[PDB]
Amino acid sequence: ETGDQRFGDLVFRQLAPNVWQHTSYLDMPGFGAVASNGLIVRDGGRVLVVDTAWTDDQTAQILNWIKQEINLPVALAVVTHAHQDKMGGMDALHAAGIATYANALSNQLAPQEGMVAAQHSLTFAANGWVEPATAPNFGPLKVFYPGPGHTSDNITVGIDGTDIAFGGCLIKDSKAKSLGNLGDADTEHYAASARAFGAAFPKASMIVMSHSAPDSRAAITHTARMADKLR
Ligand SMILES: CC1=C(S[C@@H]2CN[C@H](C(=O)N(C)C)C2)C(C(=O)O)=N[C@H]1[C@H](C(=O)O)[C@@H](C)O
Ligand SMILES: [Zn+2]
Ligand SMILES: [Zn+2]
């Protein structure tokens, strides 16, 4: 909290020399404030964004913080699946002229989920790794599709050069008691998808997720075992 920095309704936390976690909150009746995490990556003389905030205005505040504190242009953005906490601020990115990327399935689902689709579609090989031709100049971002879990389109990102792997809403923390929203979840494949994420980034010691503070690899293990009980 003390290393933490605030801009508007947003909170920013530095996880690494070139990596920040952005956190936004949405008021949801019945629960109140719900936190959603994303990533900001500085790669040379440009900035890469992983996931939007809940809303356009909150996403706009991300961009202005980046402008004020990092003072580098945002080259691209990648969203991890077609839900509001990750894709709710797509209009703000496009208004700023930022190239946006997402799983082709996410872009296909986006209208059904009330989301604005990304400009470009990512495709993946059978082993889960992104097809390089669909993700040009992603720098240190290593995009990996672990398979159907939280949703059928969820993707994960590793930051090369760091110990950081981003699991999005697929991974819950090691002391969680639930897997959250299983409304659009694949109950049979979730456990294997979680373990595939861990195997894709075997050297990652800091696991960043959407709705919890950065945890260890225990978050991956715990998430898988909770998903085992789904089958
Ligand atoms: C609602 C949001 C949730 S629930 C989230 C899970 N951990 C938080 C929680 O309930 N605690 C353990 C404090 C809230 C999830 C999720 O668990 O993946 N994602 C979003 C929703 C969703 O992706 O299904 C929508 C709003 O994006
Ligand atoms: Zn989701
Ligand atoms: Zn979520």
Swiss-Prot record:
Q: Which gene encodes it?
A: blaNDM-1
Q: Where does Zn(2+) 2 bind?
A: D85, C169, H211
Residues that hold Zn(2+) 1 according to the record: H81, H83, H150
* Example GO molecular function: zinc ion binding
Extract the Gene3D superfamilies matched here.
Ribonuclease Z/Hydroxyacylglutathione hydrolase-like (3.60.15.10)
Q: Which InterPro entries match?
A: Metallo-B-lactamas (IPR001279), NDM-1-like (IPR050855), RibonucZ/Hydroxyglut_hydro (IPR036866)
Q: What is this protein called?
A: Metallo-beta-lactamase type 2
| Membership in a protein family | Belongs to the metallo-beta-lactamase superfamily. Class-B beta-lactamase family.
Q: Which organism is it from?
A: Klebsiella pneumoniae
List cellular component terms (GO): periplasmic space
Q: Which UniProt keywords apply?
A: Antibiotic resistance, Hydrolase, Metal-binding, Periplasm, Plasmid, Signal, Zinc
